[PDB]
Amino acid sequence: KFCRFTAEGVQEIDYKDIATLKNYITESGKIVPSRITGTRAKYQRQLARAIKRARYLSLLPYTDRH
Amino acid sequence: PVIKVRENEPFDVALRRFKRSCEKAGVLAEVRRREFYEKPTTERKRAKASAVKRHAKKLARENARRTRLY
Amino acid sequence: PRRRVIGQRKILPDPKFGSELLAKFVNILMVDGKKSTAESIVYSALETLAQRSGKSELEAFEVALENVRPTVEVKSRRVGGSTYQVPVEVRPVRRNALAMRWIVEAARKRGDKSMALRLANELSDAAENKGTAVKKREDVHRMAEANKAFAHY
Amino acid sequence: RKQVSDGVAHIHASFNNTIVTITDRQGNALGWATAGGSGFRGSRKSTPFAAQVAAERCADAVKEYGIKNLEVMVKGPGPGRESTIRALNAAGFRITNITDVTPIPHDGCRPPKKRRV
RNA sequence: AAAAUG
RNA sequence: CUUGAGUCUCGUAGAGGGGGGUAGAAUUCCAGGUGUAGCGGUGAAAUGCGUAGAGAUCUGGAGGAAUACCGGUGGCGAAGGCGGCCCCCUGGACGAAGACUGACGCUCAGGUGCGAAAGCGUGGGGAGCAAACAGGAUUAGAUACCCUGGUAGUCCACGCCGUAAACGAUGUCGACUUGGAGGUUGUGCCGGCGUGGCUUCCGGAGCUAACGCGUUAAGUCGACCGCCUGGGGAGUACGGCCGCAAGGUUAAAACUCAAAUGAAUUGACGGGGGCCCGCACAAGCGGUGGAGCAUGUGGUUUAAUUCGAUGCAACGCGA
Ligand SMILES: [Mg+2]
Ligand SMILES: [Mg+2]
Ligand SMILES: [Mg+2]
Ligand SMILES: [Mg+2]
Ligand SMILES: [Mg+2]
Ligand SMILES: [Mg+2]
Ligand SMILES: [Mg+2]
Ligand SMILES: [Mg+2]
Ligand SMILES: [Mg+2]
Ligand SMILES: [Mg+2]
Ligand SMILES: [Mg+2]
Ligand SMILES: [Mg+2]
Ligand SMILES: [Mg+2]
Ligand SMILES: [Mg+2]
Ligand SMILES: [Mg+2]
Ligand SMILES: [Mg+2]
Ligand SMILES: [Mg+2]
Ligand SMILES: [Mg+2]
Ligand SMILES: [Mg+2]
Ligand SMILES: [Mg+2]
Ligand SMILES: [Mg+2]
16 A cells, blocks of 8 residues: 555645556546555545546546547 | 457457456446446445445454354 | 265176176166066067177167267256256266166057067167167257257356 | 458347447448347347357358458447357457447436336 | 235 | 633635536437348247348437546535536635634524425426336236336426425533544644544443443533323314415314333244255156046935044044
8 A cells, every 4th residue: 555645745646747647547547446556535536636637638538448 | 448469469368358357447347236226325325234244244353363163 | 865975786797798788778678676577678689689780789789879878968947937958968877877768768669569679679770870769869969959058057 | 242351340248138240440330140140039048158159150141251350349248248259269260359348427327217026 | 937815 | 800602813624505617428319331130128028129221330410417437434514415627706614823802602482594305386408217108018806016118207597395214213502421443634743652623433331121322422410492291083173374286384172992112032934044954856766646446535315324533643544
């Protein structure tokens, strides 16, 4: 587990940081549960909002089947 | 789950990859759960029941830790 | 049964030919415990088959059995309120048991004079894939093939 | 008619039936077979074995096209999900891609009411 | 599958 | 006066509310291409759809509704409730340092406001779903359950209604009284050690009819309010008030019963679960049910057809 955002002092998760966000989505493009990646709940919420923002801007896919 | 069969990878192995990809994505569970409408009261009840029974089974585990059967 | 410690019974081989399998065939043909009667019937019919095949007694009997032995049968099972016929493989001992029983049954429903003649005629018919024993095997196979989809549980 | 050598098999695997359509890469149907149309009506129609026979019949229905490779598109929860793919591989086709295309709403329309059986 | 009553 | 209550300063988390915009998935529909005999549905079917080309598959378009994953006995809200993303307007909560006011508090009949779903009015909208309704099944019947369809309605604006097992079946405020493991959200110091807010589970004393509750009390106390007085009759009638209506609200009496009821205990039962057994199924072989006759019984007959046994456990039984 262990949370990579707590150990790095992240203020916000930055939807622009695609390289980081891609570690928190599956092959299908879905947000990985925080129980699998060990993210803290506060950072899991920030991360979901960032992923959805990036999906809106087409920096990330909603699905693997667009 | 989009599987592309790899060079020299046999058909059975690509099939197993496709199966694991489907299970990880949980497509079949999504289809099952979406076949009929589940009322919100029903869904909240079922979620609570799952949490309660998970907690109680761990209680059973941690407490059978002490008990000797013979 | 539920407990299942059924140990098999020893069958004395038939006196003339020393075959366990023909001994079981005599047992299947026998009625009312009259074993010598059944033995005379089988021996007479086997003499006839040997003459009409010019091959041997046991070998001609085996040809007939090979043509009557089923390989797959169906077993009923209720599933969702309906009744399914489930195809299953036949163990070899059951293969012989079914073949012998079917041949005896078919012989009994023939119209020839004595039982020995009916048995000889049925055995020859079987040797050329013709009589109602082989027909029974054919319908059993046909049912199993039609229900191949239910081979799983 | 025209030869293709690169086709797509679409497997519509519902709980009651299986439909196999082999199209070209542009989505134009070349042939099709179904479990129901392969000698299976009722309890037998919704079985993996019926789907396998349907896939065999569909491969026979496009033999004249000289199709060599196949991307497989699997849609639905039914029992003919993988038995069709096995049948398509065993008919000499080269499966180069297996994709699940079961449509999943991102919430969407309300499903029918639950059955009280 | 259906499956009432005393 | 400052300790209760409040104000200010900095910050924090949040599906809190109102308005507006937008994204992607999917269903349906419409147009066209490929293609051909089925599709769809069930326990099994049929109705239904399809050679006037369906279903399947691909492209283009229209439209409405909801926001997968995240997501969690997670969060926010007085309660009802609230879930994509973005903006605008806005409510509350909490924390750390202080500074300020100086009992400004608590509760609250009547009053007033808010208040799920369904329903009602006017005007829109209508994909999906779906009361009613129709057909097909099932059945002894089947005004159902199941299937194929399908209209209000579900959606929007505005108004009305004011009720729910609107539940923690637990009124609000405050104080006090051993613990344990978690969740979530702040903050001090240096992973550890503290310290606040909300929250889930377990449990001690005590309490409780028991079940249980147990620092978020159903323990120990104080303040104020609401409510109860056997079961039925009845939350009904009449009247009043409210409502467009549906109805809501306030709320009896006669008469009738000797109970009604709560929790827990032993059984028995279950078309509840689990594990076993039995010629219970299964795998087999031979019978009975048909015939003639023997025998017992029922019935009928008779002067009498003596009496008894008479689901399994009477009927070649007492005999
Ligand atoms: Mg349905
Ligand atoms: Mg009053
Ligand atoms: Mg409404
Ligand atoms: Mg209306
Ligand atoms: Mg309207
Ligand atoms: Mg219906
Ligand atoms: Mg009420
Ligand atoms: Mg509620
Ligand atoms: Mg309550
Ligand atoms: Mg109440
Ligand atoms: Mg108050
Ligand atoms: Mg407790
Ligand atoms: Mg009233
Ligand atoms: Mg009134
Ligand atoms: Mg049996
Ligand atoms: Mg008789
Ligand atoms: Mg008598
Ligand atoms: Mg007496
Ligand atoms: Mg008597
Ligand atoms: Mg008596
Ligand atoms: Mg008795």
